[PDB]
Amino acid sequence: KRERMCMKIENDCIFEVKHEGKVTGYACLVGDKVMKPAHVKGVIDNADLAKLAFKKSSKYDLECAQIPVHMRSDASKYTHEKPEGHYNWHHGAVQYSGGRFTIPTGAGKPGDSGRPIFDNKGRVVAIVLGGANEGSRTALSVVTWNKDMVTRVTPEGSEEW
Amino acid sequence: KRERMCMKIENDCIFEVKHEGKVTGYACLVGDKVMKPAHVKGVIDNADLAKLAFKKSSKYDLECAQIPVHMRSDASKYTHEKPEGHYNWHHGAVQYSGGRFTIPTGAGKPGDSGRPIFDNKGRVVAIVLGGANEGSRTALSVVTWNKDMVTRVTPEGSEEW
Amino acid sequence: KRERMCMKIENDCIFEVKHEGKVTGYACLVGDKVMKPAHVKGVIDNADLAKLAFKKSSKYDLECAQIPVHMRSDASKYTHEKPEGHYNWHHGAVQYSGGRFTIPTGAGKPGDSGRPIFDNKGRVVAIVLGGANEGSRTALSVVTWNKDMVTRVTPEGSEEW
Numbered sequence: 001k002r003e004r005m006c007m008k009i010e011n012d013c014i015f016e017v018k019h020e021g022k023v024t025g026y027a028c029l030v031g032d033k034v035m036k037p038a039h040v041k042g043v044i045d046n047a048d049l050a051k052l053a054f055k056k057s058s059k060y061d062l063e064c065a066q067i068p069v070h071m072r073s074d075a076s077k078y079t080h081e082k083p084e085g086h087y088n089w090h091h092g093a094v095q096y097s098g099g100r101f102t103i104p105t106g107a108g109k110p111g112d113s114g115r116p117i118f119d120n121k122g123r124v125v126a127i128v129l130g131g132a133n134e135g136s137r138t139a140l141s142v143v144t145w146n147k148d149m150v151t152r153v154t155p156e157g158s159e160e161w
Numbered sequence: 162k163r164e165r166m167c168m169k170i171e172n173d174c175i176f177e178v179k180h181e182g183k184v185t186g187y188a189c190l191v192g193d194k195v196m197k198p199a200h201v202k203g204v205i206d207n208a209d210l211a212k213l214a215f216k217k218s219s220k221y222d223l224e225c226a227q228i229p230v231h232m233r234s235d236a237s238k239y240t241h242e243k244p245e246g247h248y249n250w251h252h253g254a255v256q257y258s259g260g261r262f263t264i265p266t267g268a269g270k271p272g273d274s275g276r277p278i279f280d281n282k283g284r285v286v287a288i289v290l291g292g293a294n295e296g297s298r299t300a301l302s303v304v305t306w307n308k309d310m311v312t313r314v315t316p317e318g319s320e321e322w
Numbered sequence: 323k324r325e326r327m328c329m330k331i332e333n334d335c336i337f338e339v340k341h342e343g344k345v346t347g348y349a350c351l352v353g354d355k356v357m358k359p360a361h362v363k364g365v366i367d368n369a370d371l372a373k374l375a376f377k378k379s380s381k382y383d384l385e386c387a388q389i390p391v392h393m394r395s396d397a398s399k400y401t402h403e404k405p406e407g408h409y410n411w412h413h414g415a416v417q418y419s420g421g422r423f424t425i426p427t428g429a430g431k432p433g434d435s436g437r438p439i440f441d442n443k444g445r446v447v448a449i450v451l452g453g454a455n456e457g458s459r460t461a462l463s464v465v466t467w468n469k470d471m472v473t474r475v476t477p478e479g480s481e482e483w
Contacts, residue, residue, distance in 0.1 A: 069318055073296035077259070208343035 187275035190236035262301035348436035351397035423462035
């Protein structure tokens with residue numbers, strides 16, 4: 001149920017970014033803005049998305065742009081509330097404990113950057129950039145939103161995926 | 162129940178406007194004032210209403226007038242609260258989502274300008290002016306009310322019906 | 323039986339008179355003349371009757387004109403005999419006592435000017451102009467026809483409908 005809805009939403013709101021023929025990251029639609037990690041390099045597998053003018057910012061390591069009108073109905077719905085507990089993810093379920101996003105599996109691999117972290121109701125919470133090896137766990141370096149502000153949370157030792 | 166009540170209220174609070182013998186708009190009785198969109202041209206199918214001196218405002222794209230005394234019992238009652246959810250309309254059910262009034266079907270056609278958008282209790286929330294083709298949905302350019310002011314919402318690409 | 327005949331004759335011998343889009347009086351066909359009260363103003367809702375030249379006389383409060391040839395078969399028949407008793411009317415039955423036309427119900431309302439009062443044989447005897455609120459009854463101020471003379475009976479305190 002929840003897993004099926006989450007994967008259906010991911011299918012409609014993720015476009016692969018390929019460089020030299022191999023995928024390196026993913027750009028996702030949140031609200032009414034195209035969001036992609038800045039550190040990843042490549043082009044989006046979409047004629048409409050690849051032609052947009054991407055605003056750059058190195059402090060938050062994020063690229064943003066305005067989506068065209070005809071993909072507004074194909075974009076996720078955002079939120080800013082982050083209660084403690086469990087959240088969905090493409091490679092499993094993520095745990096929010098003490099202001100940190102951690103991977104129970106520790107199976108994070110390069111090339112998964114940009115996949116949204118989903119809420120219980122399908123809302124998007126943050127965006128994955130990289131993680132830091134906490135032995136059996138990994139602390140995620142993710143980009144979230146405040147009420148009206150963007151912040152970047154990077155645990156020590158994190159590597160960009 | 163709700164559909165029949167809404168139709169009953171609409172018959173007592175909607176007056177057609179025709180130019181050159183063909184209908185082009187609608188005027189509604191909300192509170193104690195006649196409200197008709199400014200862009201639609203013609204005449205209201207009533208001597209008492211057609212004789213009134215209308216106040217013009219191109220910024221909000223609306224005309225108003227104070228209703229005569231003997232239609233004061235034949236006017237819809239208004240509201241300013243807009244909870245998230247579903248609202249009734251003469252052509253189906255409209256979806257209010259994130260500050261946007263959207264049509265689930267995209268079935269709005271020119272000549273329907275001025276048709277009000279009702280609430281659950283029969284209260285009027287807004288007045289339709291135009292729409293925009295946003296994928297398989299249609300964002301409605303409406304005229305809504307705050308506690309005391311008039312505000313106008315116009316999604317990009319909207320066409321005046 | 324009588325009601326059906328009176329209604330059928332009234333349908334064929336009454337034309338609503340409207341001013342500024344609202345009906346205010348009726349022009350009835352008697353013999354070969356069109357009668358209309360002088361206090362009511364407007365245009366008869368008919369092409370042929372609009373272009374006819376009307377003779378106006380403020381003493382009797384009545385306008386008369388000659389009907390077209392082809393409409394001679396769509397008119398009532400007249401009489402002057404007025405024996406004591408009851409006479410039929412569009413809104414019920416009227417009583418003729420002591421040279422007065424009285425309304426048992428007192429249900430006369432403005433806009434009832436010009437409605438003829440019929441005989442028991444369907445013949446038209448008088449034309450209603452106004453009424454006087456006398457207790458539970460209403461004395462009718464009407465224009466009648468003698469053998470040769472047109473006379474007006476107006477009780478004290480009557481009002482023009």
